[PDB]
DNA sequence: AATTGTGAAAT
DNA sequence: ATTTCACAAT
DNA sequence: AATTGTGAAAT
DNA sequence: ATTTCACAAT
């Protein structure tokens, strides 16, 4: 919430309260939440307590009340449109994933080089693909200010600048390259090679 | 190294020293490394100092000496064979990524349901795909004890147990589901929806 | 009413 | 900065 | 030889 | 537990 460590769990808590809600479970204790998340229960309680007093003593937490509270925190009572740039290996994995079946996000358009064979067409799921040179045109009346960036590493900086210039305010980047961009622009990195190589480091200790 | 925070950066440092080495840069200061990584230089120095005294005062760090030192720490003077289970959206993104062009890892085989149409064939890059029921057979003389797990969430636990039973010691899992497995088995999670939704949380604060 | 919310300690 | 302990409050 | 390695403080 | 300060050592 305030604390970065807690803010990184919010999405994990929301999923769990949703899963309980689907499974017909109406109450959950912080021990049950801790165990489904693989963390300690004291962190769940300290996490929730930044948002006020959400449980009751001796009972636990009302699953629906918490599912809905977290949806509000996560802005999941409104729809967020995202774009994806770079329709290549990971690009396409994401494009075909129905984010919107579980949360109120969706990739509503994608971009690639103007010469890509997918430009001018749609995804099997109806997501239109356009040339990167037209980004300014399509960004009008999309409500998009968030980009998924899945272009080659050597092009990440150059394409990040195009996105920012064109109005993008937040980037999830799969390139392992620190983007130099103004500090108001939020950048979250996913680094798959580093994740795999770090797994191997832990296995060898 | 000892400290978890530092161990999670090792892979990031290795890449940077490799990149410098490719770019013909022979020396690097902790400020230059900090700036390419987007962190503070005091953490770079404190990070490196867990491994001893790797630089020299007034100079910085010898890029080749550090590239090679990190390759040793990361076990990158030997080849690690990985398997991938679940040849679906993210599965395939990974299968087509040449991990071995940059590090000494490779996905040397994959698995899917026995009825999948890819079973019995190879990847465009020569990676053979087999039925999950044959996992014990193929795990013989592969040197594989690491799995990438990219099956649906509802099947993650059931397939994680098959992998462990069959000899797998480390799992990188893309399912957002805490796997319950013995504590000697190292599990690293990647959670793409939570990463995207957390980006959006940061953008709205 | 069996489990929360939170100071204080530990890391 | 973050986790975990530990217990009076309900 | 301009920058490291590290106690001490801050978080 | 982790980061960042800040400075004597080279
Ligand atoms: N695929 C993986 O599993 C994997 C693994 C580790 C890291 N990564 C990283 O993720 C990034 C992308 O990976 P990938 O394998 O999907 O790469 P890819 O080459 O398969 O996809 C890149 C896409 O971006 C497009 N592109 C290039 N320049 C562009 C531009 N100026 N504007 C718009 N689009 C442009 C390309 O045409 C291509 O479709 C890389 O930084 C890579 O290092 C991917
Ligand atoms: N694709 C994405 O961008 C994305 C985004 C967010 C989360 N995820 C998560 O990653 C996981 C996989 O995603 P996906 O979209 O690639 O799913 P997918 O359904 O596209 O792929 C799953 C694959 O696993 C195979 N499979 C099923 N049971 C199996 C078994 N018992 N043994 C071996 N293989 C089996 C399926 O045949 C299929 O090929 C899910 O947990 C999903 O929530 C993916
Ligand atoms: Mg990489
Ligand atoms: Mg998910």
Residue numbers in the entry:
A (entry chain A), B (entry chain A): 6 to 210
Text of the article:
In many Gram-positive bacteria, the redox-sensing transcriptional repressor Rex controls central carbon and energy metabolism by sensing the intra cellular balance between the reduced and oxidized forms of nicotinamide adenine dinucleotide; the NADH/NAD+ ratio. Here, we report high-resolution crystal structures and characterization of a Rex ortholog (Gbs1167) in the opportunistic pathogen, Streptococcus agalactiae, also known as group B streptococcus (GBS). Rex is a homodimer consisting of two domains, an N-terminal DNA recognition domain and a C-terminal Rossmann-like dinucleotide-binding and dimerization domain. The dimerization of Rex is stabilized by the swapping of the C-terminal α-helices and the dimer binds to a consensus Rex OPerator (ROP) sequence (TTGTGAAN4TTCACAA) to repress expression of target genes.
The structure of Rex in complex with a palindromic 22 bp dsDNA fragment containing the ROP sequence (5’-AATTGTGAAATATTTCACAATT-3’, the conserved ROP consensus sequence from different bacterial species including GBS is indicated in bold) was obtained by co-crystallization and belonged to space group I222. The asymmetric unit contains a single Rex monomer bound to the corresponding half site of the ROP DNA which is predominantly in B-form, with the Rex dimer and complete ROP site related by crystal symmetry. The combined DNA-binding region of the Rex homodimer presents a striking electropositive surface that complements the bound DNA. Each Rex monomer makes a large number of phosphate and base contacts, allowing for high affinity DNA binding. The DNA-binding specificity of Rex is mediated by residues from both its wing and its helix-turn-helix regions. The wing comprises the connecting loop (residues 56–65) between helix α3 (residues 45–55) and strand β2 and packs along the side of the DNA, spanning the phosphate backbone of both strands on either side of the minor groove, involving both nonspecific contacts with the phosphate backbone, as well as specific hydrogen bond interactions between side chain of Arg62 (NH1) from the wing and N3 of adenine 3’ in the minor groove. The recognition helices (α3) of the winged helix-turn-helix motifs of the Rex dimer bind two consecutive major grooves of the ROP. Base-specific interactions involve Arg50 and Arg51 of helix α3. Specifically, nitrogen atoms (NH2) of Arg50 and Arg51 make hydrogen bonds to guanine 5 O6 and to guanine 7 O6, respectively. Ala47 makes water-mediated contacts with the bases (T6 and C16) of the major groove.
